[PDB]
Amino acid sequence: SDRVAQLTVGNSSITTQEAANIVLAYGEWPEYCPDTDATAVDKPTRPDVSVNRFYTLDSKMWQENSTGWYWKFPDVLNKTGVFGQNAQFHYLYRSGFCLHVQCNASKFHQGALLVAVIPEFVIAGRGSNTKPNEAPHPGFTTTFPGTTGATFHDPYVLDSGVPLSQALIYPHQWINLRTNNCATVIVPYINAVPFDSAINHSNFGLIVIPVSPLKYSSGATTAIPITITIAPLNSEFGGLRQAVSQ
Amino acid sequence: SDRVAQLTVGNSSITTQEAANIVLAYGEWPEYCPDTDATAVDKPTRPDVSVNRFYTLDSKMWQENSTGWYWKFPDVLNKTGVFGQNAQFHYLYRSGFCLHVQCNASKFHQGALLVAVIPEFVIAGRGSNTKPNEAPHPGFTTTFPGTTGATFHDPYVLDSGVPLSQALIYPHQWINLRTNNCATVIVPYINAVPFDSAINHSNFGLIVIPVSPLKYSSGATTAIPITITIAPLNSEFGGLRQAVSQ
Amino acid sequence: NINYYKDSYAASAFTQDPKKFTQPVLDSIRELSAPLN
Amino acid sequence: NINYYKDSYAASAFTQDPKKFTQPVLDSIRELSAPLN
Amino acid sequence: VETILEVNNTTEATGLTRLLIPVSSQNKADELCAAFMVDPGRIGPWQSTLVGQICRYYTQWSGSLKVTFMFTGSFMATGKMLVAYSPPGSAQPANRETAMLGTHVIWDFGLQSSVSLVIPWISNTHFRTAKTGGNYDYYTAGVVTLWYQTNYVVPPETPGEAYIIAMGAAQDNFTLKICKDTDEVTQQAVL
Amino acid sequence: SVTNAESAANTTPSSHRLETGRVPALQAAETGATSNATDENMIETRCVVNRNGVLETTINHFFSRSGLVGVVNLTDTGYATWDIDIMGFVQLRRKCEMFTYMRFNAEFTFVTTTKNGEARPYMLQYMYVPPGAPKPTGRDAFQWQTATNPSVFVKLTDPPAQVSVPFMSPASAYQWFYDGYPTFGQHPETSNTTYGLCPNNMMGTFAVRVVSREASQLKLQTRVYMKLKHVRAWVPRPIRSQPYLLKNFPNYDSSKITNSARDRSSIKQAN
Amino acid sequence: SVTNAESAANTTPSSHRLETGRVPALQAAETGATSNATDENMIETRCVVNRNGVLETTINHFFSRSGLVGVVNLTDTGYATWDIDIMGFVQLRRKCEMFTYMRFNAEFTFVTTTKNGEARPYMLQYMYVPPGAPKPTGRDAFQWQTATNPSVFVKLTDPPAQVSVPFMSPASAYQWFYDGYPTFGQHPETSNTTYGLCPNNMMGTFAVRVVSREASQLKLQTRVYMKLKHVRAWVPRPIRSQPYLLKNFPNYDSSKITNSARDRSSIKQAN
Ligand SMILES: CCCCCCCCCCCCC/C=C/[C@H](O)[C@H](N)CO
Numbered sequence A, B: 001s002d003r004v005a006q007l008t009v010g011n012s013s014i015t016t017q018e019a020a021n022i023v024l025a026y027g028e029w030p031e032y033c034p035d036t037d038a039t040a041v042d043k044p045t046r047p048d049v050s051v052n053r054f055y056t057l058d059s060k061m062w063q064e065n066s067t068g069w070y071w072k073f074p075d076v077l078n079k080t081g082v083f084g085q086n087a088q089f090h091y092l093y094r095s096g097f098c099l100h101v102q103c104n105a106s107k108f109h110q111g112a113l114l115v116a117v118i119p120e121f122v123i124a125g126r127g128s129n130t131k132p133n134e135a136p137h138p139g140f141t142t143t144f145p146g147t148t149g150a151t152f153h154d155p156y157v158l159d160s161g162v163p164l165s166q167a168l169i170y171p172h173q174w175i176n177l178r179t180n181n182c183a184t185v186i187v188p189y190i191n192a193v194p195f196d197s198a199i200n201h202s203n204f205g206l207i208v209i210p211v212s213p214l215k216y217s218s219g220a221t222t223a224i225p226i227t228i229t230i231a232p233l234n235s236e237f238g239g240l241r242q243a244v245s246q
Numbered sequence C, D: 001n002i003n004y005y006k007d008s009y010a011a012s013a014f015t016q017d018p019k020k021f022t023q024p025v026l027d028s029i030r031e032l033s034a035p036l037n
Numbered sequence E: 001v002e003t004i005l006e007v008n009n010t011t012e013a014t015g016l017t018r019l020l021i022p023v024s025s026q027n028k029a030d031e032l033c034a035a036f037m038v039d040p041g042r043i044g045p046w047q048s049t050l051v052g053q054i055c056r057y058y059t060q061w062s063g064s065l066k067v068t069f070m071f072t073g074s075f076m077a078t079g080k081m082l083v084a085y086s087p088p089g090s091a092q093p094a095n096r097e098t099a100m101l102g103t104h105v106i107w108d109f110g111l112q113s114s115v116s117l118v119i120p121w122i123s124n125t126h127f128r129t130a131k132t133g134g135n136y137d138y139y140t141a142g143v144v145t146l147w148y149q150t151n152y153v154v155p156p157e158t159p160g161e162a163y164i165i166a167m168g169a170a171q172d173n174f175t176l177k178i179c180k181d182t183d184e185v186t187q188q189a190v191l
Numbered sequence F, G: 001s002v003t004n005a006e007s008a009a010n011t012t013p014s015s016h017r018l019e020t021g022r023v024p025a026l027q028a029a030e031t032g033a034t035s036n037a038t039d040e041n042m043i044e045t046r047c048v049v050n051r052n053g054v055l056e057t058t059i060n061h062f063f064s065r066s067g068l069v070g071v072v073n074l075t076d077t078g079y080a081t082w083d084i085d086i087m088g089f090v091q092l093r094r095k096c097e098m099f100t101y102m103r104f105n106a107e108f109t110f111v112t113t114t115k116n117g118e119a120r121p122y123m124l125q126y127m128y129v130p131p132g133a134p135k136p137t138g139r140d141a142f143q144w145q146t147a148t149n150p151s152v153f154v155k156l157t158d159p160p161a162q163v164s165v166p167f168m169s170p171a172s173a174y175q176w177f178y179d180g181y182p183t184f185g186q187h188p189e190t191s192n193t194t195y196g197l198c199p200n201n202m203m204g205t206f207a208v209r210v211v212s213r214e215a216s217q218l219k220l221q222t223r224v225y226m227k228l229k230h231v232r233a234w235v236p237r238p239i240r241s242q243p244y245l246l247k248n249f250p251n252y253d254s255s256k257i258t259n260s261a262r263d264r265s266s267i268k269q270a271n
């Protein structure tokens, strides 16, 4: 009554037979914007079925010498389906998310994955340069990876100068290959403004990081796949105009 | 209190100072589909602001030797804005329309325009051929003109073998250049099925036809523009999947 | 707490809730019981 | 608002009426109605 | 209070004829007529008005605006126009079907011919700084364009060119904050 | 009617209109009245409770800031006089000329500096000379006995002096624009040197000296800042767009008239 | 639930447990939840009434101390400007970057010293220039008339000036980390000079000059200390362990990454 679970959203479902508990980021449920916090005059749209379902991204390979992966979540679903079309045509966006990460293994493998969100996860530029007009800055495909993700260079400092030991202050879970084969984190809309654009601003970002490496004996399956399925709960869009991609 | 009028839908307005009355097609108002007539299981989406507003198409030229124009209305708004994006991503569609046609002139010009809708307006193929496997059929740009419209060849038979004298059984108005400078027709969703696709099926079609030609004296403005502004009242979409254009 | 100005930001200046950071889980886990069945 | 002087001009210091500038017309015009018949 | 905007502030313009938008008969349909930015604290047509010179004493403005178009022409000349406000995003629209996707009003020339397009408050933040350009393109408000719905028809023995007077004002939602200085006056020595 | 306001106006939800005869979009600008088309009759809108403060846009909050009214040079004659007129500088003059009539109090501040800039521990006397009172003719004359005139003794090493001035006009309000002549008789066609001079705005002279019997060897500038308070305004008028040329006259340049909107490429290009 | 606290938590007496099924020691760290094993279920303990004060660990008591925000050099151009950003020094920046969102007031203090160190009796004007206001272009320009900008006159022989600053952001809170771009359009792959620049944190310019008409011959440093008050915080995040390199960017060094724990001999030797 605690390890088996099923999450149905829209027309999509997710079943799991071994898992940890469902985390709720900062104890708040994602709901629609009230009339007190709202500031835009035009009425928003609410599909509530076509945009609130489980979108699955591609699979990342789990090997022995991996470093980690990170995504920018309001930017990964800008090319997929009706959510992407609404986020391209509209100008303001507000929604919560629900992130499931599946990485199953046998009873002879071992390892550990830290899966956490960071609100306003800023990428740093590696390089010792104290002059502001010459220092190295990250590219557009490094800051906004998209539906294909991006790997780390230094997971010890989260590519931001911040130790990943203290990354447990964020909403997080552990994929330990002997306890659970998946992780789930529900996240509300965390921002200092009621509505914001879903094109040039990414609220948060997931990070799967190998803490304990993947080890096994000869004969076991080598390549361990990693899949992430996400769901934009309670989506709201505003400011309908011409479609822009970026 | 009868000739001045203003129609506001969504974020768009239409003002007129000389006009006829507002026609209502078959005395029925366009409303949402009830739970009795509905048959699809998945929940539809209702933007209600971004898709219910006034879309303006390009202007057609009003000369002395014109014949007429026709549009297929669920197919003209398949490339314009959030309505077009929803009609491309979704699979089922149901809405009513509100069609305004502006053609203003001075007090020295004269003419007459018949503006009417035809539910299931089928284009005929001109040519005397009784063999079914060789007869001439109309092209794709003749059946589905789009946001650029298409001109008639024989307005006397509506390009369908049907006399346009009897075209007054349809919901219609007259743009007489001495009484009104515009026409308006509100149309409900007239179809034998509750939901239908807005890509390979056009419910109805407007037809502006010069009955009395445009005449004037030397010195008056020659080229008389014609504009049509339409509004998809009470739009509903269903069956969200990959985006298709045609 | 006396203020001498019309504006309240020129003035002079025990709530705790650790259960949203320590245990932000949906299904509540007990103390004496095992966390997972 | 305390004053330390006999004269009141040495002291220290929401009415709106835009209808005398925006619509200073004799015959009042309505919102939904046309302005001139 | 409505106040004539200087939309025709281009070159090769005389003193007063900067206040008029010329309208004439076309040959091709859907043609564009005029366009201008909405930011009142920005150099352009919103500088000859009165809300633009008062919101230049204040740093942050808020609320909805209003633009009234009056048609100065002959009584026998008719026509239609499409005034379309477009929120930020891409540049000025190139077609009329692009402009219809925004917030538009279709206005015909009749017995009243004094239309008023409202410009609603569509912003992310509560306020907007009255300083635009460069790194301040985050506070732009959009573009108001004026197209040709059908045409400017006209009978014989009637002039074939008329003018539109555009005026601008605020609404009851208007709000101003943080008093700053203006940059219209300059002084070297005492007068 | 008169309505109060703690914040800006709110918006109510609106739906689509489909009917004839109700046209909130067609106005009449020929009637000399502002359009009244609101958002609830133009586009479908939502409901917001707008709690933005409109309190700091009133006349009192707009005028109660100390600007600059006059610099008085004392490049030591022994004394320095200054006719009191607030039209010397074009920063406060514009705000004051936004209105036709104004009735207010004043709060003068005197900031005195030296040649380069300094505060030498000397003594300064500021004296107000009302219209008709005898103006001092020397640095040690009897007009500085101030048996009835308001005078202020301050040092250069003191904080800047500050006084409060009441409404001292014989009329009911100060008018910044006066369409008429103070005198009678035949007026000339060539040069009207008295056109637009309201006698109800001349308030007197402001004199300043260094309290001494010998002659102190320093030159100093004293700046007079005014903060209006308890202000009331009447008959608003447009704001000046041409550069200023004179103090008491609204003169401008016939040639080289500056346009009130900068030039662009064409009317069809909003960029 | 929300619980109040006047002191720390107390302890209750405990005895030995001898039973099966009741295991307060086995947790599950995979569930993303902190362990809740208390002392009363781990070891036999006594009862204490802990009256230790936990009052001085709140956000208000942690942030209401005047640090250092900015040094402005005036090695007299005649004036000195300073863009207002509190990320110049790495002492207060760390405490501020412990959180993601902060909403607070400010209390600036201005301590001005001379070349070696001194207080010469001169005059100084500090002026705040909001975003959009004209920045002074000289030591005697008209931008120093401050008809609407807040300005402060102080002497070097006076106590340090002090003002209180409200929440002046257009957003609802100051965010120290912004994952996005202020503008639109195509963004480059080589050098993103605009990544991570929140426009809701740029607050304006702080200018300073010596009130004079000649040119005083002194060089001086003015220090701007900020004391936060009425502070609220949101979304705590870890504290930086790498050295700082730039002001507006969280840049670090790819090579030479400093470890967050100093080295010892082995893992089996706690000494
Ligand atoms: C020396 C200490 C007392 C100083 C007394 C000076 C105050 C007397 C003058 C009152 C000023 C009233 C405000 C300005 C008056 C008129 O509007 C100006 N002449 C404008 O032209």
Ligand SMILES: CCCCCCCCCCCCC/C=C/[C@H](O)[C@H](N)CO
Binding pocket: G084, G085, G086, G087, G106, G108, G126, G127, G128, G150, G151, G152, G163, G165, G168, G174, G201, G202, G203, G204, G206
């Ligand atoms: C000269 C006397 C008045 C001085 C007025 C200066 C106060 C105006 C600036 C307000 C400072 C707000 C606190 C810091 C703001 C932002 O967080 C920083 N830019 C951080 O980058």
